[PDB]
Design a protein around this ligand. Structure first.
Ligand SMILES: [Cl-]
Length: 378
């Protein structure tokens, strides 16, 4: 085939087991999501139910975290982020239609509240109190968008503070980086209202993916372990993994992206004339995805050698990366129906070295040019 993506067999084992599980209704806590709908002013009960089914939201998040720790902190942050996946989707559906001035107004409201809210640590204001703080806004939905973002960041902070296991300065650093991710998400939307590489880099932030990647730090206890991995290296892993998501998503969304002005690497190839058909486009996508998995494997193995105390974190990033395959091929209805898909070939342990040696020039060039972006989220 020309559509093959190679991946280590043991990078897919957790997902295969997870997809046989029943939905965990107690963990989903749908009634608690409905309470948050009412409190935030985002969505309705009916809309929350429709979005949950459209995303297949529980299995969507479990594809990213097929191994999920059961300590209370991890369970609480998983549940909060499952609920925020729903509200964030509804917020995104609304504000991606904002024009430039509406996005600037939204960003200004978010930035006005940032210090006065964060400086109340650990006694954060409720959504009601925060809505009173905001100045008049021309678009009324913006107040609900802003205070939902803050309530999510505040609730995250309070979960991490529970029982004092994580030192406060690390809780606050995580909070700041999560708020940074929200700010860069808004900025990415603003940019779209006004090169190929800058377009691709923008695609890494236009869906707040960093927020779900940061959960790996909670689940694998990197906020409590003393380690020598600088924060910049965390984001190397995050952004390489996000690139995988962007590229496979562009393949599965092309039939829709064809018809609107959404950015897509497949659309760029057709516009520049570098692919003549979807067979060629799928081949190019497979070479990129395949190269990312090779580069991720090398980063994971080098990370484990240098920082053995973070071995679990490195592995979980690998699983999260493979999770995007299952999200697009198995879990999300609108992605599963794409006639344009890649095919996974599993690499067994005996063949790992020979797999890594066999590289593709095109896929490697895309990955190497992308990683040059790394040389504000943190
Ligand atoms: Cl501003």
């Amino acid at each position: 085939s020309g559509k093959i993506v190679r991946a280590p067999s043991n990078w897919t084992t957790p997902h295969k087991k997870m997809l046989k599980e029943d939905e965990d209704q107690e963990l989903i806590a749908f009634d608690k999501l409905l309470s948050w709908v009412s409190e935030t002013g985002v969505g309705t009960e009916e809309q929350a139910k429709i979005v949950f089914k459209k995303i297949n939201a529980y299995f969507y998040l479990r594809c990213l975290y097929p191994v999920l720790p059961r300590d209370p902190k991890s369970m609480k942050i998983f549940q909060l982020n499952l609920h925020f996946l729903i509200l964030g989707y509804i917020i995104d559906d609304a504000i991606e239609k904002y024009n430039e001035n509406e996005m600037k107004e939204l960003i200004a409201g978010y930035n006005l509240l940032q210090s006065q809210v964060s400086e109340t640590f650990p006694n954060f204001p409720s959504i009601f109190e925060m809505k009173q703080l905001l100045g008049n806004m021309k678009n009324d939905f913006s107040k609900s968008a802003i205070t939902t973002m803050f309530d999510y960041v505040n609730k995250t902070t309070l979960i991490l503070l529970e029982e004092g296991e994580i030192a406060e300065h690390n809780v606050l650093n995580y909070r700041k980086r999560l708020s940074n991710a929200v700010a860069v998400y808004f900025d990415a939307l603003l940019s779209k209202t006004k090169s190929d590489g800058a377009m691709l880099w923008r695609r890494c932030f236009d869906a707040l993916a960093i927020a779900v990647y940061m959960l790996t730090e909670v689940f694998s206890k990197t906020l409590v372990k003393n380690h020598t991995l600088p924060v910049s290296e965390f984001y190397k892993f995050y952004l390489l993994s996000i690139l995988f998501c962007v590229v496979i998503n562009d393949l599965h969304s092309y039939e829709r992206d064809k018809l609107d002005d959404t950015d897509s690497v497949v659309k760029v190839w057709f516009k520049e004339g570098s692919v003549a058909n979807m067979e060629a486009a799928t081949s190019k996508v497979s070479k990129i995805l395949d190269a990312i998995i090779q580069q991720m494997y090398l980063f994971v193995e080098e990370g484990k050698a240098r920082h053995p105390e973070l071995s679990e974190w490195f592995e979980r990033i690998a699983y999260m990366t493979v999770g995007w395959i299952y999200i697009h091929k198995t879990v999300v209805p609108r992605y599963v129906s794409s006639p344009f898909q890649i095919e996974v070939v599993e690499i067994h342990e005996n063949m790992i070295s020979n797999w890594l040696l066999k590289k593709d020039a095109y896929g490697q060039r895309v990955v190497q040019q992308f990683l040059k972006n790394l040389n504000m989220l943190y």
